[PDB]
Amino acid sequence: KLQFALPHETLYSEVTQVNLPAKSGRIGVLANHVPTVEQLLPGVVEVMEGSNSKKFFISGGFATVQPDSQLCVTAIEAPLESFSENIKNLLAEAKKNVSSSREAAEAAIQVEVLENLQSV
Amino acid sequence: MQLVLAAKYIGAGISTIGLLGAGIGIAIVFAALINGVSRNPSIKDTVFPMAILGFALSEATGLFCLMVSFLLLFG
Amino acid sequence: MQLVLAAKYIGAGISTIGLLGAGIGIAIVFAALINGVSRNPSIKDTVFPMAILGFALSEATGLFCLMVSFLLLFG
Amino acid sequence: MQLVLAAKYIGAGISTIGLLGAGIGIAIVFAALINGVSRNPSIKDTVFPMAILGFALSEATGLFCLMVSFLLLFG
Amino acid sequence: QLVLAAKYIGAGISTIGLLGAGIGIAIVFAALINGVSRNPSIKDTVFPMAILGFALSEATGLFCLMVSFLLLFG
Amino acid sequence: MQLVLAAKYIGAGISTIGLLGAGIGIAIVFAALINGVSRNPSIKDTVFPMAILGFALSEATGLFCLMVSFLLLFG
Amino acid sequence: LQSTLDNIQSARPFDELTVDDLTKIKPEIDAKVEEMVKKGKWDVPGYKDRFGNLNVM
Amino acid sequence: DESILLLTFLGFTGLVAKYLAPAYKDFADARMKKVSDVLNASRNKHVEAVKD
Amino acid sequence: ISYAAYLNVAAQAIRSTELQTASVLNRSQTDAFYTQYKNASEPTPITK
Amino acid sequence: MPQLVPFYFMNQLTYGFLLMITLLILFSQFFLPMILRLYVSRLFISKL
Amino acid sequence: MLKRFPTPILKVYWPFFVAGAAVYYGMSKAADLSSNT
Amino acid sequence: LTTFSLYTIIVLLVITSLYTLTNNNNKIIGSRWLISQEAIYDTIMNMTKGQIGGKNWGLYFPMIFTLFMFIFIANLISMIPYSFALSAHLVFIISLSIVIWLGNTILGLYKHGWVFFSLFVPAGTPLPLVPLLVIIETLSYFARAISLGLRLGSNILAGHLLMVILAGLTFNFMLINLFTLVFGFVPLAMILAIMMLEFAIGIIQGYVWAILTASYLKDAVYLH
């Protein structure tokens, strides 16, 4: 059972399969999966409760299967549909920004976000 | 001829060496099963058909080796 | 002639050894399959055809040893 | 003469042993692919050219071995 | 006669050396595939080095093969 | 006479086996290089000269072995 | 402009046509190809962004 | 010997027509369409400009 | 930079389709002024 | 193998290298630019 | 259909052609050496 | 006349058909068969733009293309159950490999002087083992001469020979006892899988040839 909670939403609180992109590659959870902590990287996420499947765009967070089979996912914001080319225009600007210059790291994060955006 | 009869028995022995590889192979499949199922304890029912297949194929390479042994032994 | 005929029966046994490599090989592909499927759950649709291909290519190397064995044994 | 012809067939058997190495090798390249995919399926299209490249290169050493065998056997 | 036979036997034994190179090649390519699957992005730096490593791993096997040809033909 | 001449050629074949380990050795160095660089994205400047040293030492055992092979073969 | 509309209406080979016929009405076609052979590339800039990349990967 | 090899080749060409030929038709068709659509789209594109 | 700063920047970026609500956008902007103190003695209040 | 040791090596190799020079020119001057004609034409049509 | 385009691979590819000529001479001699093996 | 000479003619006639009876009408859409020769063009364009990636990538693209197409076609010839490859005359393939290697060595020597030998200095390392690292770079550089050739030659030849040996054996299966006469199709199917594999490794070999002599050319044009 997925507990998907956000500081302004909580779309899940049983969720059968969840496929997650983590700093360990991709992890899939099906029923009892090993009770772990995994840092969620910025992601394109699928949550399936039964066969019904919900596509989520995830801003990174943490995933933690609890030993009581509660897959606590915490992330800052969520659906995949919300992602939809102005972001590409902003990312072009962000590429420019790294040339001059926290801003260096930020623009690097923007390149990461560009990858995450491309994933959609 | 003593030399020929000997040669059959020698060649048979040599054939037997090949079998070691298959033995190790079977274990490798089973090791993966244990770790895998531990890693997701619910995958088992899907995986168990796959496991018997992988066993059989690794074993089969061994069978072909053992056949060449039996051919030298009995013909 | 007894020497050459003895060479066939012995030489066949020597060739049989090569099969061992393929035998371990089959297992390595299937072990990878079992581990991978346990990680993702759902990757399996893609990976299962790849697993069969990997087994076949490893198996083929084993078969090459077997045909050399038969060149000496029968031939 | 018989010693020479014997030596061709014995020498042939001995060479065949080299093939086992390639059989394990092929499996290893594919195992890396399978593990890579299960851990990240988005990388796959970039990786596929490298996978095929590694398969061929790995296989080639086993085929070099097999050619020495055929040079002895047929030649 | 015996000398001719002997070089044919010696040729058989030398061929076995190739085995190690074959395993070697697979280890380089496996590591490439694992590294690239982890990074999505390491590949540009890594791929030239991987071909160098391949060449060297195979090359040891080619030394084995060259001794084999000196026996077999020579 | 004939036995000694034979023993040079055969002895050379036997010696050639040792080279195989160095082949695997070089690969292990390059694998580790690949792994390290993939972990850091940035260790490489320290690690690359270090790696060339590692390559040279692993190779060297093979070169000593090859030297003896040539002494038997040509000598 | 009326004539221009008629001109596209009376000529628009959008289902196929020999590249030679396009060379005949515009010898710039053959010129650009030639300039690319001369330059030392077999790339066509912008071709890839609205026609295939036709590669394994 | 080689007549067995000719049987193998006959089976091989049969498999090609079985599996590959409809797939390669669909692939070829798909690509053919894409080229056509871009070409005709651009013809349309300048026609719009004339009207403007 | 800090991991949660990384996630923060990502979250802010992630609020770009542009069709998203004001509350997200408000959650993606801040005007707060980071006053800085020490031992009372104040380094100049750089914007948060 | 005896069947792969003729002494006709240079005879064979003469016919072989003639084929290489022929195909190289044939591709390079004729057939490669004939693909490049399709590409450039497609792009020119794409532009207009 | 066919339209020729001159490609300067006949004066950029000079070390490739040079290697071919040397090997041609050596292979003539190699054929002779194998016909008198 | 000469079988080898005859097979050089067959290869030329196949290749002409790929831009004549495949390139049908010189369409701006491209014929369904001709879509293949667009894809080959682009995947080798993007490969040697990858590998060498100079301004001379396209300048060495015709040679890398006819080395592709040669191997690609000659492993169609090798699929014919009575026609025997040009590549199976190993002396042509190995000779071609050494020739291409020599034309790289000369190009490198010419282009980069006697500091061409700085290619054989790999990296900064302790000075008493710097000369060692020149020796086992030049050895590996002239390993490139034969490695490429022996790779292709062995694969194609061994494949055709493998098929012939199993075909002859499956002939002799019908001549041993009647339980083997039954299930005479089951070994034939094993040969079908191999025939598929020999086709595959032949297409793989054309790419592998053309990438390996792109890697060597990467080293030669830009030292390292």
Radius of gyration of chain J: 20 Å
Percent of residues in β-strands of chain J:
under 5%
Report how far apart the termini of chain J are: 63 Å
Main pleated-sheet profile of chain K: none
Q: How many domains, in number, for the residues of chain J?
A: 1
Largest interface: B-C, 50 and 43 residues
The helix count of chain J comes to 1
Please tally the helical runs of chain K, counting DSSP H or I stretches of 4 or more residues.
Answer: 1
Report the order of strands and helices of chain K.
H
In terms of quaternary structure, the protein is part of a larger assembly
Number of strand segments of chain J: 0
Distance between the ends of chain K: 51 Å
Q: What is the number of strand segments of chain K?
A: 0
PDB class: hydrolase
Keywords: F1-ATPase, Nanomotor, Complex
Entry title: Yeast ATP synthase State 1catalytic(c) with 10 mM ATP backbone model
Chain A: ATP synthase subunit delta
Ordered list of secondary-structure elements with their pairings:
This is part of a larger assembly, with twelve protein chains of eight kinds.
Chain H lengths: L1 H50 L1
Chain I lengths: L2 H12 L7 H5 L6 E2 L11 E2 L1
Chain J lengths: L8 H39 L1
Family (chain L): Belongs to the ATPase A chain family.
GO cellular component, one term (chain L): proton-transporting ATP synthase complex
Keywords (chain L): ATP synthesis, CF(0), Hydrogen ion transport, Ion transport, Membrane, Mitochondrion, Mitochondrion inner membrane, Transmembrane, Transmembrane helix, Transport
